[PDB]
Design a binder for this molecule. Sequence first.
Ligand code: HEM
Length: 399
Amino acid sequence: APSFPFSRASGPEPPAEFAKLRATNPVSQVKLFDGSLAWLVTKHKDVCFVATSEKLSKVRTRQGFPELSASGKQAAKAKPTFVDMDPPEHMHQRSMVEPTFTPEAVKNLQPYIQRTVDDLLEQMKQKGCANGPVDLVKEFALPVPSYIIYTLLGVPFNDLEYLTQQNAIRTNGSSTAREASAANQELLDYLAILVEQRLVEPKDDIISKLCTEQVKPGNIDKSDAVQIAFLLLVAGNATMVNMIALGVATLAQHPDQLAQLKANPSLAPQFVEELCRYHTAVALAIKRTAKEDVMIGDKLVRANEGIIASNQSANRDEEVFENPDEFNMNRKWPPQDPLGFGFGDHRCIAEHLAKAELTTVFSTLYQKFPDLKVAVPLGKINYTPLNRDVGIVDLPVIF
Ligand code: HEM
């Protein structure tokens, strides 16, 4: 059994192991860091089964749960938030914060998302690049999702820049363990203050709704409110930043597709759809433990055995997506859902918001900067370390 997780084949590529497994061993066992074994599911149909089976659990206190790192094992000791819950607890807590993320709410949020993107791009234009390239990540990819989530949560305008930087330090590969920890705890302390504040004087934000509708009535306590707001912040921010950066790099890699997008920004939604399939930046989130024996393919997963369902491999499943390793914004989509945002009950709560942020970015970026170009050879792009989910650390650009 090979050690899992695998390392990407290269900066912008998924691990090479998946294609071979899909072809000759779709459901197999892998060895985790602690020496325990777990079942790796690689086919789309099977990943969907794992994501919806009621015989499988997300509860991390169940022996056999596939923790992939020492830190993951430690984090499993804390009181869980809906991300690690099974029904009925899952939706009982998730429904507390779903309103802001519904397709309807996101549609009504479009003007705000557009304004945020516009202002950040305008800031870039004003600053210019007369003295050399600027980092697209620091100046745009990072602040866009950060400002939006922080604002929706309840953070005041004047605190956005500092908090965006601290949250970045949390996941920056350059941060030492102490630095990452300090930034993490610091964000929690800040959220605790916002909760105390909103409890006394609620405003029009997520934290206020949690305080008024859940804390005051006694449905949850203050610390719970903090953890839920914290989950909403850290769950998808780093991913968003990486998706925006990967999107820009991808368009640079395929000139004609960038030409097409520039000539028709209405293709942004299709482009984002392909981007979320092709670059599955969150590939290790669909994990379960079997509550009882369950058959998957030609394998029997016994009770208490862990399962890791690769949505990344599923999105490259040739049986569902023809020419899966080809990035094509004009792709003819099958009836089967690409799994960039997961599947089933736990499917990304912010899928619609995430898609809206990305479509707003890619329907605007090249209208504002039609001559935007990565200021370094594409093969020299600084990607996240290969043993991590795909992403880009910094991306110098000129325009
Ligand atoms: C393009 C960026 C994003 C991608 C690709 C992404 C992807 C995912 C994936 C694969 C999962 C696992 C779903 C499953 O268990 O089947 C997930 C869960 C989740 N995501 Fe996102 N996400 C993104 C952005 C966001 C944002 C912006 C937020 C916060 C506003 C967020 C909050 C969450 C939460 C809280 C969960 C747990 C949901 C649950 O277990 O019920 N995500 N996301």
